[PDB]
Structures are given as structure tokens and as C-alpha cells.
Structure 1
Amino acid sequence: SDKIIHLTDDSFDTDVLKADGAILVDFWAEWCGACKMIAAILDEIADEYQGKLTVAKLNIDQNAGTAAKYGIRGIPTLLLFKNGEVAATKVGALSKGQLKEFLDANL
């Protein structure tokens, strides 16, 4: 958790939309096994991709407005942002290797 930004409705524009470089945002909530599945995977990816990628989480129960703005329809959903825009979407739990494949394809 040392390299993961916790985003909110109030920080999203500064932390994500105005940020430099690609930002991977995990839309998640409690009572979601698949969300838990990717939590440790995200710490690993944040470390291995440091300097090329920023990793962040947005809890959709705590920040419903932002979840609605990006049309979250299931959790977890990973949105990859570049320059304030959604570059790519990955729905559901996946392995570390699968997440690396998604990132490498879109970076």
C-alpha cells in the first residue's frame, strides 16, 4: 500500500486527470472477493512499473459520484488513464501476468 494512491471524488481531477504519465485506477469496494484478489497484485505492479505508471484505487461506495461519472457497472474495474482520458478498460479479477499483458499492450 506504499505506492497506491487512494483517490476520492475531491482528489480525482488532480490525482488522475491532471497527472503526468499513465495512471491505472482500480474501482473497487468491500464485499467483493475479486476486488480482494487483485489487491496484492496491484502492490506488485505498482512497484515493477514505477516510473512508467502510477497506481491508484477508488472505492466506489465511498465515492459514488466518481464511479457514476466513469460508468462503473461491475467491480473490480481497472481504468487506464492517459492525459485525463480513459485509454483502456479491464473488467474483473485477473492475475499479475494478465495485468502485465494488459498494461504492456496499452503503454
Structure 2
Amino acid sequence: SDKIIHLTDDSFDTDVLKADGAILVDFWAEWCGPSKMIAPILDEIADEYQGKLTVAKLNIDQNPGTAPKYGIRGIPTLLLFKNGEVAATKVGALSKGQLKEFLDANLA
């Protein structure tokens, strides 16, 4: 809630694809429950990872372009970028601990 970005198909190439640093991407959709279930976790994460990561949500419900580009045929799917480069991805719902396990595994 202090770094989250309502990313769009336009402001992506510039935001994620080209920005030194790790920006996590939570692909969601108003129709997929577990999708929006991760948003809260991202916020509880926003602070603890503020300086190593920037949580950025993306609504394919109104932003198609993006998803296909990376072959994402499932939601929610998380993409951990590093200098506009998919470095790691996690699929499906998960707990704050499984997500911190994921970030600490790569992002460090």
C-alpha cells in the first residue's frame, strides 16, 4: 500500500522491463479469487522489502497485452523481475511465509 502500482499494459515496458532493481508482479483478475487474495500479502510485504523490492500489481481484466507476452495462462502468477527480466515466478495462491520464502530465495 506504499509501493504497489496499478500497472497497465502501457506503463510496463517503461516501468518493469526497464528499471534496475527487482519489481515483483502480481498478475490478477477481478474474477479469480486467489488472485486478489495475494494483494494483502504484497502489502504486508511492501514495507519489509522496501529497498530490495517494489510490489507491482497488474489487472489483465483490463490489461491483456502483458500476460500473453510471458506465456501466463494461469492466475495468480507472480513475476520477480530484475532489470526488466523475469528472474523467478510463483504460481497459485500461497501464505505470507511461502512468499517470503520465495523472495528470500531469489531477491537476496
TM-score by length of 2: 0.94
Measured after TM superposition, the shift of residue 106 of structure 1 is: 0.5
Q: TM-score, normalised by structure 1?
A: 0.95
Q: CA deviation at 1:17?
A: 1.1
Q: Report SS of the residue matched to 1:99.
A: helix
Extract structure 1 runs of 4+ deviating beyond 3 A: none
Gaps of 5+ in 2: none
Contact kept, 8 Å, 2:34 with 2:93, in 1: the verdict is: yes
CA shift at 1:36, angstroms? 2.3
> Which protein has the bigger helix share?
1
Cα displacement string for residues 17-47 of structure 1 (whole angstroms, at most 9, x for unaligned residues) = 1112111000000111101221110101111
How many equivalent residue pairs? Answer: 107
How far has the Cα of 1:74 moved from its partner? 0.7
Residues 66-95 of structure 1 show CA distances to partners (whole Å, capped at 9, x for unaligned) of: 111111111100000011111001001101
Q: CA RMSD in A?
A: 0.9
Structure 1: 5+ residue stretches without partners? none
